């Protein structure tokens, strides 16, 4: 009988919740992402910015190879910090720029040991001695505190930002503020489903909420508008035209932007002209009878437009179907049954043409990020349409078989949300480490040309990059392992800025210490991304095998080296890894690593992408849904009910539950479901009275319909995508889908089965 996910999540909330986590100790283990506590910097970076698979690295390569515990870090450089937590400080080092070690180039941080009266500081990453520049010199005092420490954030805090001098800028000149280019697919499909009008009409409202720093009064971000269908329609919206102009480019294949000045303007200055155009677009194409569309050319154009205005930018593309019109990036309907031991299954998850990868490079090359709002209704080849936006650091929003009376709010919520996102532009993340180990692999919505620079055309508060480390030499159980994440980027006001995240981990020659410091959620996030990237390179059966065997290996190692002697009829799991098996099985059951029977390739490619960007909070929830009992709800005096295991066993014919994974939210209803509730919620008297196909927001209700809406709100709170509500009536209804999210059941193997399997191979490693 194993300690369940829920039990583990609850126990930690009890012992560590509502308590200040001060990041002042070195290899300190933080609370679970599921636990809500207050964080105070104090030296090391907040667990909100970076978490690790272990907070104590093995001292040597062989030790690491014994345990086989992947050493990695999940980093969300711009994680949203709670209002009740101290904000980052902007540090300015003047003309010279931020002080750094001449050798390893690490930034001035709490890890530099000032010596010899404070004239020379020895770098904490490579041990090189440096000369404290004139303007920065300060006296040490008792053991070095240097009478500065607590006064300068870069010396006492784990996270903070530096002002970047011109030599941190492209072409050694101050960058320009970014621009948002909205590009609308106006082919038939989107004209009929009323999407075109929806976007144009709603766009008049949202263009106001465009981000702008407090230090400024109006946003420095300008905007541009385009429509298309195998042909591009650019629009001139200069702040001196009572009427907007339209320039049509038909030379797809050798696309170009027919403008400069009139394309990319201050929305405020050209307000009436833009609105004018926005009122028009819908009518303009109303009778369009075009069905084929292009795609690469659109990205190609927006990028080109930005390259010309010589500024970074973000493309908001609204597309509907598979781009079949002849032109580069033309996509065929290549969905094939090569997927079980095909060994050629990887091809399904890769773009068709070789153009998309290039376009992505060109975009990153010019700091152009592309975010895609997709409204397919049939195959669309997501592996292709999502590449550029994934590599460009953008976001992919897919609304299958879009229907206005149902999905309007889901989309408009995502859109608003996305436009208001805190975002950096034309960025490059570099992760420096202390002597002994180094960053050797990266996973995220990123692009890399060399092996040290993670390039993100755009980055937001939701994106997380997962970094794997490997042993370079040997670490000292005395100095431990250090980490410094640095992200150079341009702000929405056009300022070159550096964000720093320092973290000090412990190191040890003892395996006990390695395990005692692990974090299942962190490990699960790595394994998932690692596996998902591998899908595009190896047979899934090979990937799954590696996962299972690494899992059995980690546990077998602990068994034969740390665990006190116990019977062979028992399987021993370290506290740090209590729920690791459960989650591992969830990853293995996931559609991305599974197969054909149902679930479209488009659904697999999509999910595979969504995870690649996830932080630890997100992956934890994604792989282990949250199941809440609603019928047993405490009326008005609530605070979100206790979660219940992800198994059918915890469902009751008399109950009503809420299941959410971060993308989907299911409202399950049992047959003998109390009519009292069905009334106070769906306003109808009985169970058989509800129609699933009407999954829209139900108001009314005084005690319950309100208490349920309250929790649906609190659940969505920290979640980036606005979840798609899906009502499920018990017995033989859509439920089949629902059953998939009861990850503890068989549905691959059940939790128990997988446990049973692991033990077999752990025993096979005879010990």
């Amino acid at each position: 009988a194993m300690g369940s996910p829920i039990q583990v999540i609850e126990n930690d909330r009890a012992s560590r919740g509502g308590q200040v986590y001060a990041t002042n100790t070195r290899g300190q283990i933080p609370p679970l992402v599921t636990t809500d506590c207050m964080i105070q910097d104090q030296g090391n970076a907040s667990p909100r910015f970076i978490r690790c698979t272990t907070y104590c690295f093995p001292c040597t390569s062989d030790m690491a190879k014994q345990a086989q515990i992947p050493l990695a870090a999940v980093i969300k450089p711009f994680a949203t910090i709670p209002s009740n937590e101290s904000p980052l400080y902007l540090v300015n080092h003047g003309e010279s720029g931020p002080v750094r070690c001449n050798r390893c180039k690490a930034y001035m941080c709490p890890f530099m040991q000032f010596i010899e009266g404070g004239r020379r500081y020895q770098c904490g990453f490579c041990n090189c001695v440096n000369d404290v520049p004139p303007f920065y010199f300060q006296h040490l005092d008792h053991i070095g505190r240097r009478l500065d420490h607590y006064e300068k954030p870069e010396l006492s805090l784990g996270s903070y930002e530096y002002v970047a001098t011109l030599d941190y800028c492209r072409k050694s000149k101050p960058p320009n503020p970014p621009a948002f280019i909205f590009m609308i697919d106006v082919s038939y499909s989107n004209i009929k489903n009323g999407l075109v009008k929806l976007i144009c009409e709603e766009l008049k409202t949202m263009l106001e909420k465009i981000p702008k720093e407090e230090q400024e009064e109006t946003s420095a971000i300008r905007v541009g508008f385009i429509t298309y269908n195998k042909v591009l329609h650019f629009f001139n919206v200069k702040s001196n035209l009572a009427q907007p102009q339209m320039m049509v480019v038909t030379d797809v294949g050798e696309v170009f932007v027919p403008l400069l000045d009139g394309f990319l303007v201050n929305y405020q200055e050209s307000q009436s002209v833009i609105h004018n155009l926005l009122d028009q677009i819908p009518d303009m194409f109303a009778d369009s009878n075009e069905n084929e569309t292009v795609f690469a050319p659109v990205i190609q154009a927006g990028m080109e437009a930005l390259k010309a205005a010589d500024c970074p930018g973000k493309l908001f593309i609204f597309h509907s179907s598979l781009p079949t019109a002849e032109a580069p990036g033309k996509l065929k309907n290549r969905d094939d049954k090569k997927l079980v031991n095909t060994d050629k299954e990887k091809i399904l998850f890769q773009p068709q043409t070789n153009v998309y990868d290039s376009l992505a490079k060109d975009c990153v090359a010019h700091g152009c990020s592309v975010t895609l709002f997709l409204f397919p209704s049939q195959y669309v080849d997501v592996a292709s349409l999502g590449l550029v936006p994934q590599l460009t650091g953008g976001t992919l929003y897919k609304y299958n078989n879009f229907q206005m009376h149902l999905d309007r709010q889901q989309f408009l919520n995502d859109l608003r949300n996305d436009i208001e996102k805190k975002i950096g532009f034309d960025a490059i993340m570099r992760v420096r480490t202390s002597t002994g180990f180094r960053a050797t692999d990266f996973f995220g919505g990123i692009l890399m040309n060399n092996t040290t620079d993670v390039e993100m055309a755009a980055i937001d508060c939701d994106k997380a990059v997962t970094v794997e480390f490997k042993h370079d030499d040997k670490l000292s159980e005395d100095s431990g392992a250090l980490i410094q994440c640095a992200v150079l980027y341009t702000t929405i006001s056009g300022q070159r800025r550096l964000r720093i995240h320092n973290l000090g981990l412990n190191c040890s020659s003892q395996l006990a210490d390695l395990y005692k410091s692990c974090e299942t959620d962190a490990l699960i996030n790595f394994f998932a991304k690692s596996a998902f990237k591998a899908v595009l390179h190896q047979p899934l059966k090979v990937i799954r095998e590696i996962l299972v065997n690494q899992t059995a290996h980690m546990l077998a190692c602990y068994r034969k080296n740390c665990a006190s002697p116990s019977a062979a009829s028992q399987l021993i799991l370290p506290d740090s890894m209590k729920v690791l098996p459960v989650y591992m099985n969830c990853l293995l059951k996931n559609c991305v690593l599974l197969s054909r029977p149902e679930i479209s390739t488009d659904e697999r490619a999509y999910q595979r992408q969504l995870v690649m960007t996830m932080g630890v909070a997100d992956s934890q929830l994604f792989f282990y849904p949250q199941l809440l009992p609603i019928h047993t709800l405490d009326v008005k005096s609530t605070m979100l009910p206790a979660a219940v295991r992800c198994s059918e066993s915890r469902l009751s014919e008399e109950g009503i539950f809420l299941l959410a994974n971060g993308l989907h939210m299911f409202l399950w209803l049992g047959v003998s479901s109390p009519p009292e509730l069905i009334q106070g919620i769906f306003n109808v008297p009985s169970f058989a009275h509800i129609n699933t196909d009407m999954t829209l927001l139900p108001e009314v209700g005084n005690p319950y319909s309100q208490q349920l809406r309250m929790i649906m709100g609190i659940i969505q709170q920290k979640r980036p995508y606005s979840m798609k509500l899906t009502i499920v009536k018990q017995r033989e209804q859509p439920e089949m889908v629902f059953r998939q999210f009861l990850v503890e059941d068989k549905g691959g193997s059940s939790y128990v089965d997988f446990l049973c399997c692991v033990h077999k191979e752990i025993c096979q490693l005879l010990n």
């Binding site: 021993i572 506290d575 446990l755």
Partner: peptide, 7 residues
């Protein structure tokens, strides 16, 4: 440490 009887 959590132990489980596989039997």
């Amino acid at each position: 440490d959590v132990a489980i009887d596989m039997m």
